[PDB]
A and B are shown apart, each in its own frame.
With several copies, the nearest count.
Chain A
Amino acid sequence: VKDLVVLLFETALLSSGFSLEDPQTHSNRIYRMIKLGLGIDE
């Protein structure tokens, strides 16, 4: 629940034209699942 809520909130922050302070935090969260996209992480 923590993961999903922080994800959706941070996405909503972009939705109104607001610019985040730590783009690495969201970039890591978007890269975290593209590796599941092709399957094996490890």
Chain B
Amino acid sequence: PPADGALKRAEELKTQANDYFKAKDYENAIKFYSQAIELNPSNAIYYGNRSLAYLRTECYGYALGDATRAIELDKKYIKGYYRRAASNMALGKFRAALRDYETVVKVKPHDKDAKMKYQECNKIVKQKAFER
């Protein structure tokens, strides 16, 4: 226990739907994640991936639920950190995402796209604060 069949099914559904998302087949990837989770509910990567897909479809509540469940699975899922920080940035409650990216750059500073995103978001939040 656990049997190899469920693990293989979850892995193959993950690989299939990753291939489909490389072709941007969102609904198919969503259904294959759903089936795999029904077979294996302890995989946080599915939570993060459907979170990101929902952001591209702009359904934030489902994405944040997935992020919360993933963090309850593994507290230090860095990909989930990036995903739900970007989710909050796309929502508007800037401070939590700001703290997330500050912690990430404090622990991992050698990332270029993240640093440019952080600085541009920082000008964003400064303008939002000043404008009132």
Binary flags per residue of A1-40, CB closer than 8 Å to B gives 1, else 0: 0010000000000000000000000000000010011110
How big is chain B's contact interface, by range?
Answer: under 10
Chain B at the A interface: SS class: helix
B119 to chain A: closest CB distance in Å?
A: 12
Chain A at the B interface: SS class: helix
The chain A residue sitting closest to B132, CB to CB, is: A3
Stretch from B6-14, B17-25, B122-130 at the A interface = B122-130
Which residues of chain A have C-beta atoms less than 8 A from B127's C-beta? Answer: 38-39
B residues in contact (CB < 8 Å) with A: 123, 126-127, 129-130, 132
Beyond A36-B129, A39-B126: 8 further Cβ-contacts under 8 Å? A3-B132, A33-B130, A36-B130, A37-B130, A38-B127, A38-B130, A39-B123, A39-B127
